[PDB]
């Protein structure tokens, strides 16, 4: 049911003191299924998720290889970019990327993805036809010429239209227990008043799996927003998430409404109700 | 499975 595998590449570079740090994490739909890191915090404690071990040293050994050779290729990058904009060797800069493919459950490739970002600012991206580039500024135009000549587009597509795909369905198969799964919501609301007449009735949560947990302070029938002071979802630590919104209704028209949630796996909506339960 | 990026920007 709609699947997407993408990698988040990161070549943050440290100047002189040490070496450039290279991070490459993998996701499937949103499941971090592997993490590589130049700073191997303890011998290969590089998280690998459960359904990738059955891939003998064969897969991981070949995979761990690709990483190194890439980190060497984005060593060049970091120093070319520094050259394009002419920046001292003293500074520290960042090269990020997201490449991965989305497919329909039937197994066919819908779109290809591959973007880069230097210092946080989009630099160059592979277009939707997977055969052209879209340069941000005049520097990336230098890169573009480079890859147009190098046929780099072709190479990236070859991957996204093959290995990327031919390993997505596979990752979904082997690890179906976690990928094509859901999770129990759990959202214990709370009262908690404050000063005079303007109080608060924030909900809460124990998490789920994604985070699209839509906590809206409704208002009769029209989705209320202004009367809301909601804060961003701040995971939790036990591999779950939270979030809470803070409605400020009077002590006379208090429970003139109840907060909802809505989720994934669960069949019909679980329209919640604020009321000491 | 990672991509074999051979050419830098």
């Amino acid at each position: 049911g709609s699947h997407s595998m993408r990698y988040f590449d990161t070549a943050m570079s440290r100047p002189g003191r040490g070496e450039p740090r290279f991070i490459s994490v993998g996701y499937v739909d949103d499941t971090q299924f592997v993490r590589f890191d130049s700073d191997a915090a303890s011998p290969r404690e590089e998280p690998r998720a459960p359904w990738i071990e059955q891939e003998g040293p064969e897969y991981w050994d070949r995979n761990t290889q690709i990483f190194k050779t890439n980190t060497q290729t984005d060593r060049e990058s970091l120093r070319n970019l520094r050259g394009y904009y002419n920046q001292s060797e003293a500074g520290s800069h960042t090269l990020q990327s997201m490449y991965g493919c989305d497919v329909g459950p039937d197994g066919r490739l819908l779109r290809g993805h591959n973007q880069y970002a230097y210092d946080g600012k989009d630099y160059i991206a592979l277009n939707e036809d997977l055969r052209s580039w879209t340069a941000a500024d005049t520097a990336a135009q230098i890169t573009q010429r480079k890859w147009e000549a190098a046929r780099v587009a072709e190479q990236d597509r070859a991957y996204l239209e093959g290995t990327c795909v031919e390993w997505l369905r596979r990752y979904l198969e082997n690890g179906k227990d976690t990928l094509e799964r859901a999770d129990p919501p759990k959202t214990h609301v709370t009262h908690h008043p404050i000063s005079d007449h303007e109080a608060t009735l924030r909900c809460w949560a124990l998490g789920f799996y994604p985070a699209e947990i839509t906590l809206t302070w409704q208002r009769d029938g029209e989705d209320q927003t202004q009367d809301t002071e909601l804060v961003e979802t701040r995971p939790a630590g036990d591999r779950t998430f939270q979030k809470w919104a803070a409605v400020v209704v009077p002590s006379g028209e208090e429970q003139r409404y109840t907060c909802h949630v809505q989720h994934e796996g669960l069949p019909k909506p679980l329209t919640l109700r604020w009321e000491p339960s | 499975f990672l991509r074999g990026r051979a050419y830098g920007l």
Partner: T-cell receptor
Amino acid sequence: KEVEQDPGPFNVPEGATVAFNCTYSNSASQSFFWYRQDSRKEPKLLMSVYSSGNEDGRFTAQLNRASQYISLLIRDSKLSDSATYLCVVRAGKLIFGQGTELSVKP
Amino acid sequence: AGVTQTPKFRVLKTGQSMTLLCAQDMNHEYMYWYRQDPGMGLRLIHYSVGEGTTAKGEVPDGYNVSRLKKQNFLLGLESAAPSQTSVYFCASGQGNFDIQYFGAGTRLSVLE
């Protein structure tokens, strides 16, 4: 093993055409390269395959990544084409192939 | 213009010292030092992905190497001895382990 290439001296007639076969154990390989080494000198890049199939111009390169097949096609052979034709597979860190000789007979 | 590799030929007495020069013009960040024996495949000795740095492939031997400057890769044989009697190809090229460009090659014969 790793990269499995053709046997020995193939003696293709002049005007005729030739096809080579190269195979790779690592199924998840990436890019491929047909080099040409004139006995006895340096490998000169001839063909490169980043996708499924590459032409340009008298040389063709068919790549089925499913069956793991990469082939070289040399139509309208010249007596000059005679040389060892290395096959190179990238994926991971670029492994060379022993090679495949080839003597065009006049 | 091209990838120059000097010298073409050279005779060595075991224990003597020589150093092969491989210099390039294309501004390639990537260079390579390969060894090829008669009928035997291409063997990777060292490689450098930049103006410093260096790596493996088949090093445990009388091969060391320097990328002091970017234009050229030097292969040095401290104390020569068989093997090391072969033909060497240095190679460069933009892109990491992709298309590469070899020089004429150096035919080495070190004799007892």
